[PDB]
Symmetry: C2
């Protein structure tokens, strides 16, 4: 019974991180948008604080992965997939910090906000978006492995 | 023995929406903060875009709950719980839109941002915060019931 409990718990933790990573796509939809009377309305630039929000969500992700890496009884293969995810979140944070002049200024234009947190935009991804793409790829893989472990434990019952 | 596969799939969806609601707490940490060379550093006001980010996330929570209501095999008891959460997310959005003059302006101050997306706010929660608190209370309940159902399926096998 402890086997299914450990698989479920691990999957819950990975699902949590996966959602937070995908949540950044919801933040990117707010770039150059203000809360209007009927929902989000176009109101360009001044995106610094929104990028700060994304930065905080990815910091939470990094902290959660730091905790996951130290979990006992985890297979070396799973531990490695977690590291690939944590390398990506660490990269995003380091890159953003290095781009403070462009991301922390009083008027961060829409295009520049996209180079940080918009993976779908057809522009440059030189202020964190490239790292965010890798983070997405990495978390998708860890979620798949975590969900497969849940199914295998459910099979053994 | 169908219960277990469909109970895992439901708890997955509730966990997704749950993490999204808690993600607002992470966005609240970025209020009056810019991305500095060593992480988030103090730089007050100009929070409009961050609140828009939080709006986008709760908008995603509302849509996912709407989809969850139309789910197959969803009993009446559970549907009532889902509806209680959606009413709360809808209320947050309505309140945010109605406060567009305070939340979509050029300089949303730290205190005004907290009245919208900070549940710990010792001030007035008059621009979305109270609605977000009730949303938090409702989603915790739905996740508790979804995670209990998961445990009942496992114990049955």
């Amino acid at each position: 019974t402890k086997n299914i409990t450990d698989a479920v718990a691990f999957a819950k933790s990975v699902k949590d991180v996966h959602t937070l990573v995908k949540s950044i796509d919801e933040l990117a939809k707010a770039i150059g948008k203000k809360i209007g009377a009927n929902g989000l309305e176009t109101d360009a630039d001044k995106n610094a604080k929104l990028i700060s929000g994304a930065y905080s969500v990815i910091s939470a992700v990094d902290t959660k992965l730091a905790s996951l890496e130290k979990k006992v009884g985890i297979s070396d293969d799973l531990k490695g997939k977690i590291t690939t995810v944590k390398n990506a979140s660490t990269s995003f944070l380091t890159k953003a910090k290095s781009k403070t002049a462009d991301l922390g200024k009083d008027d961060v234009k829409d295009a520049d906000a996209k180079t940080a947190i918009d993976i779908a935009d057809t522009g440059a991804k030189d202020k964190g978006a490239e790292e965010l793409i890798k983070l997405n790829t990495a978390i998708d893989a860890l979620l798949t492995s975590a969900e497969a472990a849940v199914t295998a434990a459910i099979n053994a019952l």
